[model samples]
Target: MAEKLSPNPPNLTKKMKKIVDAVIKYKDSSSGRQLSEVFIQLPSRKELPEYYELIRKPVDFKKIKERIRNHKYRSLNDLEKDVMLLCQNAQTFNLEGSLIYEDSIVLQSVFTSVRQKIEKED
Candidate 1:
C-alpha cells in the first residue's frame, strides 16, 4: 500500500487557485474519472504529497471506485509537462514556488494509468 506523503504548499495565485478548483471538481466519481484511489496514495505509497504538487499542477479527473483496480488516469497541462517539468526553480529543482518533485511523477503516472484503463468505457 502506498502511503500519502505530504507535498509542500504550492505557490498559489488567483489564476492558479481557479485552475486547481476546476481540476479538483473533475475528481467527482460521476465525472467518469478517478485518481488512483483514496485521499492520497501514489500506488499504495503513503508518501503521495511528495509527488502530487498541490499548487503547481491541477488535474481534470475525480476519485472513483476503480482505484483499487487501477491507479492511472489524470490530466495535466502539456506545456507544464514537456518544458516546465524539465526546468527547475532557481534555488532548488523548482523555484518561485514549492517543489513537488517525486510525488508529481507518481501522481501523473497513476493518472495516466487510469485513463488507459477507461479509454474504452469513456
Candidate 2:
C-alpha cells in the first residue's frame, strides 16, 4: 500500500541499489529515499483487489503495514515536510562536471535522510 512498508515491493529500480551493513548506513545511503519510495508508492489493498490472487488467499498485507504506518507518512503535507527536512541532500557529484560515467552518477546522488546526517554517520 502507498501507506505501508514492504519487505518486498512489486517494482524496485536497480539504479537505486546500495550496500550498507548497518541500519544507520542504509538509512543514509544515496539510494535510501528511492528504495524507501518503492514501498511507499505500492498499490494499496482496497485500491487493488488482485493481491489475494497474487499472494494466495489474501494475507493481510496490513499486518506488516501496521508496524510501518508511522514510517508511512500518509499525508502529502507530512511526506513533503519529511522530504524537505530529511530527503536526499547536497545532490552534487564530480560526475555533474563531466560526462556521466553512469555508476558514479548513481553513487554520489544519494547522501542522507536527516538534513544534518547527510555528511556522516549519525
Candidate 3:
C-alpha cells in the first residue's frame, strides 16, 4: 500500500539538498567569488538598456538562491539549467575577451566541478 503524501508541510528532498549543498560550495569557491560582485545582482536596465533587449530571461546568483529557498527548483537538472543560463547571459552581454566574459567562463568551470562531485556521491 502507498502512503499519502501531505502538501501542508513541505521539505526539501535528498536530491534538492544535494543540489543546494553543491551550489553553496560553488558560491564559496574562489572562482565563484571572482564574479560574485557582478553576478549576484541583476543588470540595471537604466545603466544597460541593451542588456534587457538582448537577454530575454535574465538570471543572477541572488535569484537562484531565492528560488532554492522558495522550493522552486524540483531537481538538480532544474538548478543546473538556471545556473547555466546565468553564465550564458553574462557571456552574451559582455564582449568575448572582456573581464566579465572571462569570469563567467571561470564560474562555469567551477560549477561543473561542483556538479560532478555531487553526481559522484549519488
Candidate 4:
C-alpha cells in the first residue's frame, strides 16, 4: 500500500515566494491575462476530443497556480517549464492564424521577459 501524503504542506519558503510572486505578476499582465482567459482551463474532452490526443501533456495557468499554492514547484526552472508547456500546447493545438495561437505567441515572450526581470532582480 502507498503511504498517506500530507494534505497540508509547510508554508512557502522565500525562494518559493519569489517564484510564485513572479508567476502571479505574469498571470495578471495584459498578455498573460489574454492567454489565461482561453487557456486557464483544460479543453473539455467532450468539447474538443482531439485536444487530449494531440496534447500529450496539458498545462494551464489554473494548474500552475494550484501547483504554486501547493508548494509543488522545486525551482523557477520547473515553473518556467510548465508555463512554456502551456503556451506550446496552445500553439500546437491551434492554427497560426487563430486567436489562441497568436495569444500564446505573445504570452510566451511576455513570460520570458518577466522571467528575465525576476532573474535580474535576484
Candidate 5:
C-alpha cells in the first residue's frame, strides 16, 4: 500500500549513502521530531482504518512507542521510504495537521499502522 510512497524512488547515490551511514549510528538520537510527541496530534478513528490496527495491539505503550521513537531502521532507503508514507498518511488524516488531544494513543496507532504496511511489503 505504501508503494506509492516512492514511485521508483531513485537509488541513493553513493555520496548520499555515505552521509546516511554516519547518521544511522545515532539510532537512539533525538535529532528528529520527538516520537513521543507524535502522540500529541492525531486524526480520528473514523478517518484511519489502517491506524486502528495499531491501537488494538497487545504490546505495552513503551515498547510500541519505540517502534518509531529512537528507531534504528535498516537503511537510508528504508527511512526515506517510511517518510513518504508518514507524510502521505498524515496529510490524508489531516492536511492542516489539525487533530484533537485526547487521541494521543492514535499517534502510535497511525505510526505503527504505516510501519506495518512498509515492512509487510518488503
Candidate 6:
C-alpha cells in the first residue's frame, strides 16, 4: 500500500499546509478515485512544489503492476526501488511532467520496512 509522510519543521505557507492536509487525507482514504496513485497518491502534479514536479514524471502504472505482482513486493524498499526506477526511466526518456508526473506531494518521512513489521509484531 502507498504510505504517507509529512513536511514538518521545514515550515510551509498556509496554502501549502492546506494542500498537504488534503493530500494526506486522500492517502489514508479508501476511495479508488482519489487522484493519481502513480506514486505519491496525491491529486495532480500541478499541486506539487515546483522543484518536485520537474523530476516527478509519470510511469505506466498499469504495465508496472502487471509486470510486478503485489506479492512480489515483500518489503517497502522493493516498492520504493520500483518507483525510483520509473522516475529514472522517465528522466532518461524525457517524459512529460504535466501528464505523467501528476500527483500531489506525499513526502516520505520514515523508512519502515518488513524488518520493522517483525519487530513490531514481536
**Backbone N/Cα/C clashes per model:** 33, 1, 0, 0, 0, 4
Q: Is candidate 4 or candidate 5 better by TM-score?
A: 4
Local accuracy of candidate 2 as per-residue lDDT tens digits, 4-117: 454323211111122111111333245444333322333566886564345332212132233224334333243234332222221221134443223223323332233224
Candidate 3: misplaced stretches above 4 Å?
1-33
Per-model TM-score versus the true fold = 0.24, 0.22, 0.72, 0.71, 0.27, 0.31
**Which lDDT tens digits does candidate 5 get at residues 1-122?**
32323222333233233332232222224455334344323545678666765544322233322333334334445544443344444444443535422232344354445445544544
The lDDT of model 5 is: 0.39
Error of 6 at 108 (Å): 9.2
Model 3: pairs clashing at backbone N, Cα or C within 3 Å: none
* Best of the two (2, 3) by TM-score: 3
- In model 2, the clashing pairs are 30-110
Candidate closest to the true structure, highest lDDT:
3
Model 4 scores a C-alpha lDDT of: 0.70
- lDDT accuracy of residue 114 in candidate 2: 32
Model 2: lDDT to the true structure: 0.30
- Clash pairs, model 5 backbone: none
lDDT of every predicted structure (CA atoms):
0.33, 0.30, 0.71, 0.70, 0.39, 0.39
- Model 3 lDDT, residue 52, Cα: 98
Model 6 clashing residue pairs (backbone): 44-103, 45-102, 45-103, 58-100
**Candidate 3, residue 57: lDDT:** 96
Distance from true location, Cα of 112 in model 1, Å:
0.9
